[PDB]
Structures are given as C-alpha cells and as structure tokens.
Amino acid sequence: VLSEGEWQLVLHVWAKVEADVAGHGQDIWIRLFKSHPETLEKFDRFKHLKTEAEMKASEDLKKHGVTVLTALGAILKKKGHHEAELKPLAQSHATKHKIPIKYLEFISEAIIHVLHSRHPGNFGADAQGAMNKALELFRKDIAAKYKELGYQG
Numbered sequence: 001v002l003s004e005g006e007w008q009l010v011l012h013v014w015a016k017v018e019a020d021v022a023g024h025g026q027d028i029w030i031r032l033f034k035s036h037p038e039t040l041e042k043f044d045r046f047k048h049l050k051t052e053a054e055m056k057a058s059e060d061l062k063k064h065g066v067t068v069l070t071a072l073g074a075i076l077k078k079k080g081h082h083e084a085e086l087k088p089l090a091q092s093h094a095t096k097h098k099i100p101i102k103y104l105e106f107i108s109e110a111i112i113h114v115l116h117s118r119h120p121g122n123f124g125a126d127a128q129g130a131m132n133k134a135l136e137l138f139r140k141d142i143a144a145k146y147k148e149l150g151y152q153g
C-alpha cells in the first residue's frame with residue numbers, strides 16, 4: 001500500500017508525461033524492444049519492425065503507445081483503487097496476448113528508464129521509488145487476477 005506522498009510523487013512525474021504521451025510512448029517501446037527483443041514477438045502487428053528507425057516511424061506503434069500509457073495513467077490516478085480497470089486488462093493479457101509477469105517487469109523497467117532520462121527534475125530517488133512501488137502494486141494485482149483467470153503468467 002502506497003502512502004499519499006508516494007502517490008503524489010507518481011502523479012507529479014506523470015503530469016510531465018502527459019505533456020506529450022505519444023513521444024514518451026515511443027521512447028518506452030524503443031527502450032523495451034531493444035533491452036528485451038523477445039517482447040516484440042508478442043505483437044503480431046509490430047513484430048516485423050527491424051530497427052529503431054522503423055519503430056520511430058510507425059504511426060500505429062505510436063498510437064498503441066498512447067493507448068498503453070493512457071490505460072496505465074488511468075490506473076495510477078486511481079491510487080490503488082484500480083479493480084475495475086484491471087479486470088479487462090488482465091483478461092486480454094492473460095487469455096489473448098499471453099503476457100507473462102516477467103514481461104510486465106520489463107516494460108516497468110523501460111518506463112522507469114525513460115522517466116529517469118527525460119525527467120530528472122521530477123524523478124529523483126524518492127520519486128523513482130514511489131513509481132516502482134506503484135508499478136509493483138500493479139503487477140502484483142495483475143498476477144492475482146491472472147491466477148483467477150487460469151493463466152500462469
């Protein structure tokens with residue numbers, strides 16, 4: 001359980017992401033696909049992308065980054081009371097996409113890496129710790145739902 005102070009550190013940096021969610025999403029995808037190439041294989045729609053240049057030039061990938069981060073943002077804004085938001089997300093990711101918790105850890109790492117790079121003014125050690133805590137809560141709750149849905153994760 002995160003404290004209000006921790007949630008505020010999370011929401012304060014997210015406020016910066018929201019200045020340009022599309023751009024932040026592109027950086028996050030590039031970081032993820034480069035650090036853990038196996039994650040790209042889960043996207044039938046994007047697995048053909050061979051380079052960072054192609055990834056950057058993909059309008060659909062850019063659009064999906066907006067979809068992904070907006071969904072994550074809505075979850076963060078609930079400050080732990082995200083039961084309703086996690087239901088559809090866990091169902092599609094467990095049954096259709098088949099995304100292991102390990103891959104959610106990879107994207108969490110990418111998100112943190114990008115915020116650390118772009119936002120040193122709002123992503124110091126305490127802020128990063130709060131974001132990690134928020135993402136761990138997210139993955140913990142997703143894992144619990146995965147279990148209820150029949151997916152090992």
Ligand code: HEM
Nearest residue numbers: 039042043045067068071072088089092097099103104107
């Ligand atoms: C911060 C964590 C994540 C969030 C909030 C998130 C969110 C979303 C949302 C909202 C959609 C569209 C609706 C749906 O199908 O549920 C989506 C689709 C998808 N996600 Fe996730 N996702 C996350 C992480 C991942 C990761 C790490 C992978 C893969 C390694 C992944 C793979 C997919 C795939 C394959 C789709 C379908 C893309 C398409 O339209 O072709 N997601 N995700």
Ligand SMILES: OC[C@H]1O[C@H](O[C@H]2O[C@H](CO)[C@@H](O)[C@H](O)[C@H]2O)[C@H](O)[C@@H](O)[C@@H]1O
Nearest residue numbers: 101102104105132135136137139140143
């Ligand atoms: O912070 C680094 C550790 O990250 C992972 O573990 C956290 O998140 C898991 C959920 O994805 C939890 O099960 C675990 O309890 C958390 O500490 C990773 O699995 C660990 O190996 C890393 O040390």
